[model samples]
Target: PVKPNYALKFTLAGHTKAVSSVKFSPNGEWLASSSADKLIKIWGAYDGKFEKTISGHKLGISDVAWSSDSNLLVSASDDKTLKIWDVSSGKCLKTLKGHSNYVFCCNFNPQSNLIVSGSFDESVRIWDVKTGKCLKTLPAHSDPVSAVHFNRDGSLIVSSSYDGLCRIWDTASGQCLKTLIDDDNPPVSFVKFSPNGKYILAATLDNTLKLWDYSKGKCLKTYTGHKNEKYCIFANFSVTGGKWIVSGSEDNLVYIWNLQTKEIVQKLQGHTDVVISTACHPTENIIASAALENDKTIKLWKSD
Candidate 1:
């Protein structure tokens, strides 16, 4: 395992409430952080310079994901809708609505022509982003859907739920293709497809992150030692090499693990509250993490 030496680069303070999500644009140019403050703030991925604020959601924003081009973004909110924003102008390009409850998570497909969102109403909806129309809605879970994402090529989508299941769907036909879960059946808070589309990384309330080989419906490895039973925290691969798994923890630290060995390689400090969300720059050795209301700041770290 290649042990990484990461140093803190910046502490971005702006949000008035707890930050729920932080995502680096696919181009590795911008970092977007969403908060319960009901706003999304854009920052420079390389230097941590403040860019602009996106404010339109009536309630707090739950999650945000960037388009593959890095020019646009989509956000899910407690207002039961998702909005597409043009990052350059900070304008709402479209608003998607259909879920009867809060929209918890969202992602833009590889082509950026479609979006998949999960909601508290226990459904996952695919949208034709340009027309602002719902292409298909799948009754995705038995409880609130916590997270959803598309594979690199946009052929498959994965959705996790508080109901303790993660389901993989065929994006083309909206068919449930696989169900991934641990024998303990713990609630899944977050999940994503590896860029290679061979593994599914899932964060469960049991305080563990499991790397699964979805095709075989089996977990290949489990990485633990983080506190995550209460909140919906994110865990994902650092896109540059996909060798490190970085995650935000309820214990107020950013945990980085050697993906292959399932060993904790780094425990980054500096947050005063639960570290709730994390993001990796697509092409660089940098990561950004956001904390709860007590901290309300986003910190960027670069490998030394």
Candidate 2:
């Protein structure tokens, strides 16, 4: 057995409401957290000390991401606006407003020049990072788009929706390449491409994580073990060069599974409420998860 090495605990307690998202900077030096309190906060990644707080969204902040270079941070909010901030200065650099409703997710392209956002307004919009102009709007999903992510190569975009469908699109043309149905009922909460860009993994309200081969557009595997609906799924290559997948569910459990063996290697249990997000440390076999309730604490765990 591979022994786990480091264990760390962190907290961000200023939010009066539920904390929705937590993400680590690409360099693994800083962390950004957002909450229903309509504020986003940055903290020291190693010690969990509060560094700065960014405020502007009138409604809840739903999602946040760091630029490829880790120099900028982008956040989406229920106020229907996406704001970009300087990571080092903690200043709101640009506010891109166009969504008619809540903006649930936002991601920077691999090139760091374009931004894509999914909104409850039933649209996916691409924007120019420098000018804050909406480059193109794709009215594809029938229901609210829940999550959006670019492939590792930045050639494709994958989005999951409340419509029970996951769609893949061309980054340059905004054309749908394939549409995958959940069939499991309810809706998929999140969708993400594997690090190698060969497979896509999705978490659904159906209590399972489904893997798809993007090239074939076919379901590859369905990981089932959680007691309740899964809220998020994250994939990464372990330090030893193996594929490890971790999922957060309403069951209040975070399961770290070995993708190659299809086995539940470890089950992390701590949160008293629903776990909404899970982010893997870029360099280490570490993961951080946030609860959806006002607990406002982020739990970090080392995988075995």
Candidate 3:
């Protein structure tokens, strides 16, 4: 049995309220966190030192994403705007306005100069990263779109909503490719694509994780071990050279499962609040999670 250890700990106590999201730079050098206090703070991922604080949005910062090149950062806020920033200079590069309601989530496409965002207005918009223009608006969800991501190859876009359905879109035409109904469950809190683009993983309000085959448009495996709603999930080819998945739930548990054997390999417990988000280190087995609370502490763990 392997035990988890804390790598580092730091606090951004300036947020007078809850911190909504925390994301590491693609190169694992810096950590960016957004807060309901209408501020975004950048910190050193390794030394837990504060880098700088940025402010622009009027309401609160809802989500943040680092570009693959690590040069730019995009943030969405309840103020109904998206801003791109130059992390080095700590300056806002561009401000994008399109959605009428709160922008809940935003992600940069892995391959192209594009950005996809979901909003409380119940719409998903694809924007051209270079021009800051809205390319297309996808309206497949009946409720607010909670999560969105582009697959590894940038061929398809997957989005989940408060409507309890996950929909995949064709990037070229902005047409719906598949609609996956989670009828037996509540709304999906998060959705992501496997690193190889072979599968789709969804965390649901029903306290379960569902893996689906992308080509077949069907569920491949259902994992139910968490006692509360699953808020986030991630899947990747393991460092040990096999397919594996990890999920963070409102139950305050992070479970690592083997996709090949359909078995739970480890259950991590540390946070007292909901584990709202998770990201795996690109080159290592290390994983980091962010709690959805006012304190907004980030926990980093590794397997023995």
Candidate 4:
């Protein structure tokens, strides 16, 4: 019904509680959403049809990631566990457990052979996807680890924590290579590598996001204009050559900023509660934002 203005394309409904995260498959075929209702729902991305409900998490699910091939998914949960699932069959392939507290973030390496997870227990564990064995555990931070992701080449792992630090790790050695910290010392709600792997973006509790030249241990730029979150939240780069950065705000809006100019390109309005998460489509100029506690739908918006 909307012609433009990042018009509402579709509204995905099912979760009974706050939706925590939503991601599009790498191939742009499916969209997956995890919620406090202890469910993960998969839907058709282009057609907007309900595909399947991936149910198994006993506690609220916090994060979800798709395999590079878009055939498998890994989900992190408040139950202190991570589950790898086969997307096509809607079946749980393996349940990984080692953390003593909630598992906040989880992602698959490019080949989907390994998973890296961050926990409230202040640890990051690397797991073998085929064997479901803990390969290594890094005492990553002094406070809760909020987000972790592997760079595009899978040679490095980046993690952010409530300890107010973002650390880069060597994927093979499990050693910290560099730390990105600011004098403000605000807890980082989310962290991610730029699509090209040349930069790291960290979203902090102080209501700002910083881009870092992680290799040189330098911050490249800082972005403001969005209220922050208490729990782990999310932000992402656009598929259009990674020139745009999109994120949610505690003020009930989604903000997309131009990385180079540090300008707020668009302020998306509509959510009734805190916009907790945002995701960009893999192959389209489409974006989706999840409204948490108050408005529980995953609303899709299109640029054109």
Candidate 5:
């Protein structure tokens, strides 16, 4: 099969500072971009129209995630709090507090009842989404935790940190089940479980991304070609239209690689500063990318 003709579709602008993260809702109707300017902007996933801006975080928002139903959003902030928002009303529904430092990353569980968050305080906290109550706090890392995510069943949580470790935990027991570390011990900036929950994709500060078989704690493949040594850039699997890996590169480009072969398939260029985040639509061949302070713009790409 021929690869879809992917090209730039739209350039979204509004944020005054660095755009931290961009995520597509589970339903694929909305796109949310969180920024260091303390705002979360929602856009139409299909049309790229600005929908609304959720403004409540006292400081910069580090990340924003969508609930399974796509009706709610959870944002982690430098203000040391996480706030759940109603997407339709553009109002903050709840603010959860406990972390003593900046909250770096967060995600809602598959059940949409639990939220897992990582913070600069070196802890990973799980919260009850309905009640805004913290359920558990794991002393996750010796340095700042960069990312945290739940596996498909919500029974397991994976967290990566600047401490050069990626630890998998049993959600129910709050027990550390596995610790994955590369021989070089480079800081892991971001990580995600494969869609089937059988493997882990980790973006490290060594200018490479590794595919790990977490069950046995072995690195299966390493993808290189993008700069990622200085910032918390993220990468994801584009499973909708093809088996590809999409990542934001510090070299000011979006890199796409063949998942099975670990070879560069495409390089998207346009942004002026470091591209820090990218989001793939849940059910479409669509991608959104946001850049650093100098760019402060989000670009949308699509393919048939």
Candidate 6:
């Protein structure tokens, strides 16, 4: 396995509560960190400059996604709502409601005009985004849907749930196309399509991360050594070359695995509390992670 040096760069402090999610924009211009404090903060990607703050959710924000152009952002919250924001103005352009239970995750299509969301209501819904109207609802899983994502091309959607299933759907018809199940169908908390759109990475409550060949209906690899006890800790592929798959842990550490070997090459530790999410910049040797419960700051890191 190939290994490179990585280290902390800077810490972004402000949130009064746990930081639940963090995302770098598609174009690498902005970084967004969402908190259990019921707010999200924006930062300039390159210089790490504070951009603006936006808030509206009455409960903790669970997940967030950026538009392809990096001009807009969508967030899902425990308030059973989703909010679409105009990045430049930090104004709430749309307030979407319909999920019968707490909404957990959300993502935009390639064009940013459409979005899909997953909720504790045990369903997935597609939205017009412009009209704030529910376009379609896929009775997705037997249990609460924890994560939702649109593949790079916008032709498919993926959802994972407490039901221990990962499902792939045809974007247009909202039809369930394939179900990628583990041996025991272990309940997972988060899943996302790879940067190359070839694999799906899932983080499970079983304290493991699994890579799947969705089309072939197979499991590619299972990564262990990361304690994912609580919080929807996400695992992500390094978008530039797919060299590494990184994830945060409830044990106050960040784990990085060699993508090909599925070996735990590095275990990162600096946070004094639980590390909830880790995000890699789309085209750089950089990573930003957030902490929960004890410390609420977002920490930036870089490769040496």
TM per prediction: 0.97, 0.92, 0.88, 0.96, 0.98, 0.96
Task: Give the winner by lDDT.
Answer: 5
Report model 2's TM-score to 2 decimal places.
0.92
Model 4 CA lDDT for position 236: 83
lDDT of 2 by residue, 1-304 (tens): 4323334455446666778888888888777888888888787776678788888778888899889999998898988899998877778888998889889999988889989999999899998898988889999698888789999889899998877888899988988998886354468778888777888887677777778886776878777787545444333344433566677767777776677666777777777777777777787556777777745677766544
What range of 10 consecutive residues in model 3 has the weakest lDDT sum? Answer: 1-10
Distance from true position, residue 135, model 1, in Å? 0.9
lDDT comparison, 2 vs 3, better candidate: 2
Q: After superposition, how far is residue 271 of candidate 5 from its true place, in Å?
A: 0.4
Better of 1 and 6 by lDDT: 1
lDDT, candidate 4, 1-304, per-residue tens: 1122466778778889999899999999889999999899998887678889999989999999999888899899999999999988889999998899999899988877899999999999999997888999999999998889999999899999988899999988998988877576888888998988998988888888888887787788888988885756699887553467789998898887877777887788888888888888877868888988889988888863
* RMSD in order of candidates: 1.2, 2.3, 2.9, 2.5, 1.0, 1.5
Residue pairs in candidate 5 whose N, alpha carbon or C atoms collide under 3 angstroms:
none
Per-residue accuracy of model 6 over 1-304 as CA lDDT, tens digit each: 2775677778888888988899999888788988888899998776678879998888989888898888788899999999999888888989889899988889999878799999999999999888998889899998998788889788888899987889999888977888876478777889998777887888789788888888787778888887885677877777464488899988898899888898888787789898888888887868888998788888778772
lDDT of 6 at 189: 88
What is candidate 6's CA lDDT for residue 29? 77
Report lDDT (CA) for all predictions. 0.90, 0.78, 0.74, 0.87, 0.91, 0.85
Please report, as a residue range, the 10-residue window in candidate 6 with the lowest summed lDDT.
Answer: 234-243
Considering only N, C-alpha and C atoms within 3 Å, which residue pairs clash in candidate 4?
none
Tens-digit lDDT track of model 3 for 1-304: 2323324343334445666777777788787877777888887666567778888778888788889898788888998889888788878888888998999999888863888999999999988887888888888598888788889888789999888888899987988988887366388877887777888887777767778885786778887776545443333334333456666666666676776555777777766677666666665456666666733666666542
Whose TM-score is greatest here? Answer: 5
Which residue runs of candidate 4 sit more than 4 Å off their true CA positions?
Answer: 1-5
Residue 242, candidate 5: C-alpha displacement in angstroms: 1.7
Q: What is the lDDT, from 0 to 100, of the residue 71 in candidate 2?
A: 90
